[PDB]
Amino acid sequence: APQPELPYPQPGS
Amino acid sequence: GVSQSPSNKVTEKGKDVELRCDPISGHTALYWYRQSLGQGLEFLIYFQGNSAPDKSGLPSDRFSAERTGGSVSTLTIQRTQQEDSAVYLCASSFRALAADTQYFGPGTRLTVLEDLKNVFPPEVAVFEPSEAEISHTQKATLVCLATGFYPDHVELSWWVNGKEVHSGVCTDPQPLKEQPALNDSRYALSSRLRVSATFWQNPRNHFRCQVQFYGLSENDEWTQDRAKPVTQIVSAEAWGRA
Amino acid sequence: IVADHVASYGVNLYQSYGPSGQYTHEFDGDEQFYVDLGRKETVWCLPVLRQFRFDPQFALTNIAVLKHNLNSLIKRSNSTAATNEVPEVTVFSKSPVTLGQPNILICLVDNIFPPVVNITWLSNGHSVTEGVSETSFLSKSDHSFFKISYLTLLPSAEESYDCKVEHWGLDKPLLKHWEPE
Amino acid sequence: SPEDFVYQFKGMCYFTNGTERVRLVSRSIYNREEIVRFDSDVGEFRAVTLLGLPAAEYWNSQKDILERKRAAVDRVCRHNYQLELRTTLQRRVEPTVTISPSHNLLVCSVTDFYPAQIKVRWFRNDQEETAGVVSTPLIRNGDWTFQILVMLEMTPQRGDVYTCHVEHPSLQSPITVEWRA
Amino acid sequence: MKTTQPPSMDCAEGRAANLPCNHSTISGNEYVYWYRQIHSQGPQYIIHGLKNNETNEMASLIITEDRKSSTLILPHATLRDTAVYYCIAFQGAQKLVFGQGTRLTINPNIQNPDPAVYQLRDSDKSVCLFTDFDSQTNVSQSKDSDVYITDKCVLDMRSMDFKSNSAVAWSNKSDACANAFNNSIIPEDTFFP
Ligand SMILES: *[C@@H]1O[C@H](CO)[C@@H](O)[C@H](O)[C@H]1NC(C)=O
Ligand SMILES: *[C@@H]1O[C@H](CO)[C@@H](O)[C@H](O)[C@H]1NC(C)=O
């Protein structure tokens, strides 16, 4: 509140 | 899964210790915890990449973590104290603050002592199955007893004819304190191996009780006239009797 | 693509130059807030939003991930570098200009790519520092950016200003002039 | 001649008819190129460019990542929308209208208003003027206000009253500013 | 949101084991996580869910429509499923914190008990073995500090399909497999030759 979207790790560097 | 090294570490106070963690491949979030008993999970520090966003949670300035990696992590406790003793657990998720699953490693059991005088390897003894037991139920249970060891860092295992066995084996999950009154009290642990009447009665059968003790190293200084209580294996073997 | 309202929760930016990052939240193309990565604090741009709290650790862990994702793409794309796009500089007033009355000068730098620029206010070659502010880099649909710079002023007939814009897409610094009239 | 490598992640929420329609489009970009994206309508990661195919294949094989991304429409979009219902969407800034001859030209400055919805009509003695009018596009000040300048090519006579008719959601009745020769 | 769980539970092997957990104060962004810990190793992740029902090859997870209650189902309980079970309410911002958990004990189905106390010889001092007793009979700790009684642990002879219970006692006082285990105490069927 306010909430964020989250990026995930790219494979694998 | 998550890897942790060393499994065990028995050290004298004031000496520095280095704990290592190898997280799961593709896990950018690494967490360090410690857990005492009777007690629960205690947060120390965590990483996102090669940087630690939560440096608070560390018990003292002696405690520090690194992940130059940013894969493998190392926790260092310089000038160790008794209160530093616990199972140091490491965990890893894909990413931090995403409520991702934390997978834990096997832990590092750290024990810090005031002096090394109290440290002793176990006394292993295997007890021949009762002839009353073999007569009544045609089964033979041989009891193993590892006694007088300090601290409680032991791994008991049974080996029949040179190879490890797990079927018909029961080891006490926790050792007992010999004199629960004494502060640096020595410990004892028992285990049972049950086999058929015929298997025990067979003389071509060799049953050995192996106990992995974790104590001192060659690096550590031993002053006493007693034998150095180093990290060692102590066995007790017995052969089939007709 | 088509909706009543569009928001970004949020705009995560990370690049090799610096290196530097930028975390913002946008709602209908205006900057709701930004997290100061250095100071580790949330700075709100609209005063009614100051009643809310944004954990800066989300921005910091997000950028830490983007640092990983970037290095992964540098490698995957055999170091395919960013193309320096020619920015668009326009200077205008916030309100109609009257010689007496005070105003604000707005300098819009549009089509910013890569997002690395210097926006300075000048007045007969000397730099104006007092009364100047800036927006963060604001995102665009083509994944380019824009930045705005505000200079508070007291319109006068003999005082003119320039907006000095320094970007790699420009061969010489762009100077957009504003004559009071 | 500095070389730059840029990575962007945008968590974009698209809203229509208030709470009725909500869509999350999480965009991953290297540098101005969207490589992979999570669209709430498709409900899984899909590569936009052959550079994002490894990320789409990895993230889609992880049920944990996929399920958190699928929950984000409620967690980020619907939740954040409820804060806007009380703040940014309650914001109404009444426009300041002004006429100034620039004469053969009349300029209707419609400055400092919010939201963007606006209609500006010119009138020469209650009849609407269209042929000789030219407007700026909707200008974004970036300080959560817009402005629009509407010019009218005029040739006035004695008895002519030029009127600028402005409509905005913040207004109870339209604003009419007059100008006389 | 904190979770609540029965301090301990004794369930029989061969049947599903439903472990309850109540979390009336769970928030919409909190996952229901289950971990287990075998005395005393690294905690093992079992399963988690948000609203839906989840199924692992380890367990199943049923969460109520209101999300205020949940159940972990161990499909087919085995002696290995004996551990401490932690049901946790987890969200992004938070750190992982375990409660008290449920001390789950998976009891063996002892088809025919043969309670007895035996004496064994070192290949001094001799040991007393109290084996083949029933899973409903629970052993008590040693009163005198110089006589040691090890807690009961269940033995499994996989190659026989047979399982048995066993407690071990040894001492150096007045050298005693007769009045030993007088604190537990052993059933009337227990024989000593
Ligand atoms: C990368 O690009 C360079 C030219 O800039 C080229 O010489 C090289 O072969 C390319 N391939 C790889 C895999 O590096
Ligand atoms: C901004 O100015 C500094 C010198 O003041 C310079 O080093 C830097 O390269 C400039 N940035 C750009 C994009 O020209």
For residue C119, what are the β-bridge partners?
C165
The residue whose CA is least distant from atom 5 of ligand 2 is C118
Q: Where are the domains of chain D?
A: 1-90, 91-181
Distance CA E73, CA E76 (A): 9
Residues E133 and E56 in one domain: no
The string of DSSP letters for chain D reads: -----EEEEEEEEEEETTTTEEEEEEEEEESS-EEEEEETTTTEEEESSTTSHHHHHHHHH-HHHHHHHHHHIIIIIIHHHHHHTTTGGG--B--EEEEEE---EEEEEEEEEBSS--EEEEEETTEEE-TTEEE---EE-SSS-EEEEEEEE----TT-EEEEEEE-TT-SS-EEEEEE-
Find the CATH number of the domain harbouring C16: 3.10.320.10
Residues C87 and C159 in one domain: yes
Distance CA B227, CA D18 (A): 80
Distance CA B125, CA B133 (A): 20
**How many CB atoms lie under 10 A from the CB of residue D48?**
16
- At the top level of CATH, the class of D1-90 is alpha beta
Distance CA E178, CA B191 (A): 22
Find the CATH number of the domain harbouring E172: 2.60.40.10
Helical pair D53-61 and D63-72, crossing angle rounded to 10 deg: 100
Find the CATH number of the domain harbouring C155: 2.60.40.10
Q: Is C118 a pocket residue for ligand 2 (Cβ < 6 Å)?
A: yes
Residue A8, min C-alpha distance to chain C (Å): 7
Distance CA B94, CA B49 (A): 11
Residues C93 and C51 in one domain: no
Residues C65 and C103 in one domain: no
**Is residue A7 less than 8 Å (CB to CB) from chain D?**
yes
Q: Which residues of D142-154 are buried (b: 16+ CB within 10 A; e: fewer)?
A: bbbbbbbbbbbeb
Q: Which residues of B7-17 are buried (b: 16+ CB within 10 A; e: fewer)?
A: ebbbbeeeeeb
**First-to-last CA distance in chain E?**
59
Distance CA B104, CA B23 (A): 9
Q: What is the resolution of this structure in A?
A: 2.7
C67 and B49 in contact by Cβ < 8 A?
A: yes
CA distances from B10 to B62, B106, B157, B220, D111 (A): 18, 17, 21, 10, 75
Residues E90 and E113 in one domain: no
Contacts with A11 from chain B: Cβ below 8 Å: 26
Pairing mode of beta strands D96-101, C145-153: unpaired
Residues sharing a CB contact under 8 Å with residue E89, sequence separation 6 or more, in sequence order: E1, E2, E3, E23, E26, E27, E30, E31, E32, E33
For residue B230, what are the β-bridge partners?
B216
Residues E8 and E90 in one domain: yes
A7 and C9 in contact by Cβ < 8 A?
A: no
Residues sharing a CB contact under 8 Å with residue E136, sequence separation 6 or more, in sequence order: none
Q: Collapse the DSSP code of C107 into the 3-class scheme (helix H, G, I; strand E, B; otherwise coil) and give the result.
A: strand
Contacts with C55 from chain B: Cβ below 8 Å: 97
Residues E94 and E68 in one domain: yes
**Residue type at C70 in one-letter notation:** L
Q: Is C116 a pocket residue for ligand 2 (Cβ < 6 Å)?
A: yes
To which residue do tokens 């140091």 refer? B88
CA distances from C167 to B112, C120, C132, D22, E37 (A): 59, 12, 19, 38, 58
Contacts with C62 from chain A: Cβ below 8 Å: 4, 6-7
Distance CA B140, CA B134 (A): 6
Residue E130: which of B143, C100, B109 has the closest Cα?
Answer: B143
Domain end (from C14, C46, C81): C81
What's the CATH fold of domain D91-181? Answer: Immunoglobulin-like (2.60.40)
Is D130 annotated as belonging to a binding site?
A: no
The string of DSSP letters for E26-73 reads: --TT-EEEEEEE-TTSPPEEEEEESSS-EE-SS-EEEE-TTSSEEEEE
Residues E12 and E80 in one domain: yes
C65 and A7 in contact by Cβ < 8 A?
A: yes
Residues E121 and E78 in one domain: no
Calculate how far, in angstroms, residue C86's C-alpha sits from the geometric centre of ligand 2.
16
**How many CB atoms lie under 10 A from the CB of residue E56?**
13
The residue whose CA is least distant from atom 3 of ligand 2 is C118
CA distances from C138 to A9, B77, C23 (A): 24, 46, 11
Q: Which residues of B71-103 are buried (b: 16+ CB within 10 A; e: fewer)?
A: bebebebeebeeebbbbbbbbbbbbbbbbbbbb
What's the structural domain count of chain C? 2
State the closest ligand 2 atom to the C-alpha of D2, by its place in the atom list counted from 1: 9
Contact E16, E62 (CB under 8 A): no
CA distances from E131 to B6, B139, E110, E181 (A): 37, 11, 12, 12
Contacts with B172 from chain E: Cβ below 8 Å: 150-151, 153, 168
Q: Is C167 a pocket residue for ligand 2 (Cβ < 6 Å)?
A: yes
Please tell me the number of the ligand nearest to residue C80's CA: 1
Using most ligand atoms within 8 A of CB, pick from C166, C168, C171, C175 the residue to mutate for ligand 2: C166
Q: What are phi and psi of D78, to 5 degrees?
A: -65, -40
Residues E124 and E91 in one domain: no
Q: Between residues 58 and 77 of chain D, which touch chain C (CB distance below 8 Å)?
A: 76-77
Please tell me the number of the ligand nearest to residue D3's CA: 2
Residues E81 and E123 in one domain: no
Distance CA C178, CA C107 (A): 10
Distance CA D12, CA E79 (A): 50
B194 and E164 in contact by Cβ < 8 A?
A: yes
Q: What are phi and psi of C50, to 5 degrees?
A: -60, -15
Distance CA C151, CA C104 (A): 5
Cis peptide before C40 (omega within 30 of 0): no
Cis peptide before C155 (omega within 30 of 0): no
Domain B1-114 architecture: Sandwich (2.60)
Q: Between residues 91 and 110 of chain B, which touch chain A (CB distance below 8 Å)?
A: 94-95, 97-98
Contact E77, E141 (CB under 8 A): no
Distance CA B212, CA A10 (A): 43
Is D178 annotated as belonging to a binding site?
A: yes
Contacts with C8 from chain D: Cβ below 8 Å: 10-13
Structure token digits, residue A11: 């494979």
Provide the strand spans (E) within chain C: 5-15, 20-27, 30-36, 41-44, 88-93, 103-112, 118-123, 126-128, 132-134, 138-139, 145-153, 161-166, 174-178
B53 and C61 in contact by Cβ < 8 A?
A: yes
Structure token digits, residue E66: 């209101």
A6 and B98 in contact by Cβ < 8 A?
A: yes
Distance CA B193, CA B191 (A): 7
- At the top level of CATH, the class of B115-242 is mainly beta
Distance CA E186, CA E115 (A): 8
Residues C66 and C90 in one domain: no
Contact B107, B4 (CB under 8 A): yes
Pairing mode of beta strands B108-113, B8-12: parallel
Please tell me the number of the ligand nearest to residue C170's CA: 2
Residues E26 and E116 in one domain: no
For Cα atoms C113, C118, C121, give the angle at the middle one, nearest 5 degrees: 135
**Residue type at D44 in one-letter notation:** E
Distance CA B51, CA C15 (A): 18
Calculate how far, in angstroms, residue C119's C-alpha sits from the geometric centre of ligand 2.
10
- Provide the CB-side half-sphere exposure for D161 (13 A, CA): 8
- Provide the CB-side half-sphere exposure for C126 (13 A, CA): 7
Residues C171 and C102 in one domain: yes
What's the structural domain count of chain E? 2
Residues E80 and E161 in one domain: no
Distance CA D35, CA C145 (A): 18
- Sign for the CA dihedral angle at D60, C59, C28, C19 comes to negative
Residues sharing a CB contact under 8 Å with residue C58, sequence separation 6 or more, in sequence order: A4, A6, B97, C23, C35
Q: Where are the domains of chain B?
A: 1-114, 115-242
Question: Torsion angle of alpha carbons D107, D110, D112, D113, nearest 10°?
Answer: -170
Contact B137, E162 (CB under 8 A): no
**Residue type at B198 in one-letter notation:** T
Domain that holds residue C130: 82-181
Residue D141: which of D116, D164, D170, D166 has the closest Cα?
Answer: D116
Distance CA E115, CA D76 (A): 63
Domain that holds residue E142: 109-193
Residues C12 and C67 in one domain: yes
Structure token digits, residue C55: 């954990």
Contact D119, D164 (CB under 8 A): no
> Quick one: how far is CA B92 from the chain centroid?
22
The residue whose CA is least distant from atom 8 of ligand 2 is C118
Calculate how far, in angstroms, residue C118's C-alpha sits from the geometric centre of ligand 2.
6
Residues C145 and C88 in one domain: yes
Residues C10 and C55 in one domain: yes
Q: Is E151 exposed, middle or buried (0-12, 13-18, 19+ CB in 10 A)?
A: middle
**Residue type at B232 in one-letter notation:** Q
**Residue type at C166 in one-letter notation:** E
Domain end (from C27, C61, C81): C81
CB pairs under 8 A between B and D: 9
Q: Is C127 a pocket residue for ligand 2 (Cβ < 6 Å)?
A: no
Distance CA E71, CA B147 (A): 43
